[PDB]
């Protein structure tokens, strides 16, 4: 009965040279029982990408909530929301439920369309912003991901190299966690093109 | 399974170029009550070792008796009891460390934190810690209780690593210890102004200083502090 580790899952984000990458596993389970191997944890609103780990019902609820809020934002502002602004919106929304929180570990990733700067950020369940130059990790194998990223990462990686680093960080972290794995997806994000790749990993 | 009753607070210590310094206040607390004020918590063993003890005082007195008895037992059938086969700090420590771990393993611990400070026969500085759990470790500076949180930071500014030990004199080392004791008097609610200090030097031997007091304290600035925020009077 620990909400954050019932369903399981992981998300990781990295910055590169004029690019960002965000990746997640595909497992959704009920403790030991694996239930779904198609449960994606990365969503996007315009060019801003949001990954969410934790309790799956809240992952779904928050996606629907941020789709809701970004749609109204765009109608009133007459422009797409930026990663820096979206990060603040996520923080606000989570802290609004301070004493009854969503059991999640969200991760924002994207490139600011005006400045062209790569941006990533992470949050705790009550909305504390964790900004980072290098990488953000989240999920049941966060310890594993921290260890992989801290050793494998180097600054200013090219999109094709960055893909290999983040993919190897996710895969080897997931294989040391019982509640994570069962497939994986990696988003490579450039200024005006986005490539989505499904990884081949061990299915146990 | 125990609970400590009459207790002693921080014991602090450090190495310097020729030996070791150790100190501990003369208080025997009974919860929040500062019950006993003439308690010696530094106990010399021979002329080359000082055992500083914190925690339960009844258990401290038991350990005193063990060390006292250890000196007696070592003298038996030992012509070199005051020479080559005299008690070393390392012998005294390992004995205590054995007892501490045996007692925790029987779920009936001696509720103490102990620092054995001394100088070996070959001139090497000895300074090692042991507690109720049987946990042992050594470092250029060692401290118990609040000493660990407040003294060690100050003593580590003087001797931060091994190479700083030859560079530290007895004058500088004692000054840091006496300063640390003052800070503990400011901030530890179960501490006293009166304390004892011991220096074990490889040349000048054992110097045991009793009835020391914390002095050169800063309290004058208190008169300017009014209220807790707004109040001007």
């Amino acid at each position: 009965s620990d909400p954050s580790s019932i369903n399981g899952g992981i998300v990781v984000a990295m910055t590169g040279k004029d690019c960002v990458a965000i990746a997640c596993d595909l497992r959704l389970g009920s403790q030991s029982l694996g239930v779904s191997n198609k449960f994606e944890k990365i969503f996007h609103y315009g060019h801003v990408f949001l990954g969410i780990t934790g309790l799956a019902t809240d992952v779904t609820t928050l996606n629907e909530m941020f789709r809701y809020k970004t749609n109204l934002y765009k109608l009133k502002e007459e422009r797409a929301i930026e990663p820096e602004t979206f990060t603040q919106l996520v923080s606000s929304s989570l802290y609004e439920r301070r004493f009854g929180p969503y059991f999640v570990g969200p991760v924002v990733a994207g490139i600011n369309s005006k400045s062209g700067k790569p941006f990533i950020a992470g949050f705790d369940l009550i909305g504390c912003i964790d900004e980072a130059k290098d990488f953000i990790v989240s999920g049941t194998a966060s310890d594993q991901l921290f260890g992989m990223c801290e050793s494998l990462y180097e600054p200013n990686l090219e999109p094709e190299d960055l893909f290999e680093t983040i993919s190897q960080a996710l895969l080897n972290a997931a294989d040391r966690d019982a509640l994570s794995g069962w497939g994986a997806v990696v988003y490579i994000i450039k200024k005006d093109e986005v490539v989505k790749r499904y990884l081949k990993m061990r299915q146990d | 399974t125990q609970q400590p009753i009459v207790t002693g607070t921080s014991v602090i210590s450090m190495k310097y170029d020729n030996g070791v310094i150790i100190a501990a206040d003369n208080l025997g607390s009974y919860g929040s009550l500062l019950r006993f004020n003439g308690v010696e918590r530094l106990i010399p063993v021979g002329d080359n070792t000082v055992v500083g003890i914190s925690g339960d005082i009844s258990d401290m007195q038991h350990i005193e008796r063990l060390l006292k008895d250890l000196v007696t037992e070592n003298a038996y059938d030992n012509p070199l009891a005051d020479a080559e086969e005299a008690l070393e700090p390392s012998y005294i420590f390992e004995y205590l460390a054995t007892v501490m771990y045996q007692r925790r393993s029987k779920m009936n611990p001696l509720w103490n934190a102990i620092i054995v400070a001394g100088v070996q026969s070959n001139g090497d500085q000895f300074l090692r810690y042991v507690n109720l759990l049987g946990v042992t470790y050594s470092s250029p500076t060692l401290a118990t209780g609040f000493g660990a949180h407040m003294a060690n930071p100050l003593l580590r500014k003087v001797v931060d690593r091994e190479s700083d030990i030859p560079k530290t004199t007895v004058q500088v080392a004692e000054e840091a210890i006496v300063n640390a004791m003052r800070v503990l008097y400011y901030r530890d609610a179960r501490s006293s102004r009166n304390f004892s200090l011991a220096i074990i030097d490889k040349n000048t031997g054992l110097t045991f200083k009793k009835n020391l007091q914390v002095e050169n304290m800063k309290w004058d600035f208190a008169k300017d502090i009014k209220g807790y925020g707004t109040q001007k009077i």
Binding site: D143, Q144, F146, G147, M148, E150, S151, L152, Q168, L171, N172, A173, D175, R176, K200, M201 | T1, Q2, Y101, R104, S105, M107, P109, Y129, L133, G134, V135, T136, Y137, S138, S139, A148, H149, N152, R161, E162
Partner: protein
């Protein structure tokens, strides 16, 4: 109520080569949020070209190492100075640990050395004595950070041959002592960055047929 256990933190790491084996461990000793010692060694030469470390609760760790060292001594007395093989040492340690099955040594034990064919060997133990020979093992506080990195870099997991459509795996091969020490140092600097109980210093014990060599490296002290 009296709690007989404690957590002294730290982390250890064993890697086996073709004709050598390393057993590394940080020198930091802690309780809660305080540093007890910046240099307190927990990787020990136990004789017969066996190095050992029992990370976790230091008192239990020291007790175990002390007892195994003593087990090696009496093995010589009782069996005509015969060399205790690494496989025999491992089984002996299982019985030491399981002997206290109902009041365990709270430690993750790793030993390293050379097997009877002269090849590098690393054995790892859980607190109650289950053991397994491996090429690679991290133990202790930052084991979860280091271990997946070792899977990737030592055993080449999830690494395939370029251009083979993920069909041909990267072939397994032994690493040189130079390459292993690089992986150890990078593992510990990474662990130091992200784990508060890891830092101060790194001590590596290398075991070859010639004997036991030591190497020391500084780590971040924050």
């Amino acid at each position: 109520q009296f709690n007989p256990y404690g957590d002294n933190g730290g982390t250890i790491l064993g890697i086996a080569g073709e004709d050598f084996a390393v057993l590394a461990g940080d020198t930091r000793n802690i309780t809660d949020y305080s540093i007890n010692s910046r240099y307190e060694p927990k990787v020990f030469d136990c004789g017969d070209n066996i190095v050992m470390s029992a990370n976790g609760f230091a008192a239990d760790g020291d007790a175990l190492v002390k007892r195994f060292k003593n087990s090696v001594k009496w093995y010589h007395f009782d069996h005509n100075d015969k060399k205790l093989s690494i496989n025999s040492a491992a089984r002996n340690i299982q019985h030491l640990l399981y002997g206290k099955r109902f009041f365990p040594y709270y430690v993750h034990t790793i030993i390293a050395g050379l097997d009877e064919d002269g090849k590098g060997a690393v054995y790892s133990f859980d607190p109650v004595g289950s053991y397994e020979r491996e090429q690679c093992r991290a133990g202790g506080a930052a084991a979860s950070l280091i271990m997946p990195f070792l899977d990737n870099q030592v055993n080449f997991k999830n690494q395939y041959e370029p251009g083979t459509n993920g069909k041909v795996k990267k072939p397994l091969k032994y690493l040189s002592v130079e390459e292993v020490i690089k992986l150890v140092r990078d593992s510990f600097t990474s662990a130091t960055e992200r784990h508060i109980q890891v830092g101060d210093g790194l001590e590596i014990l290398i075991v070859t047929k010639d004997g036991v060599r030591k190497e020391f490296y500084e780590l971040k002290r924050d």
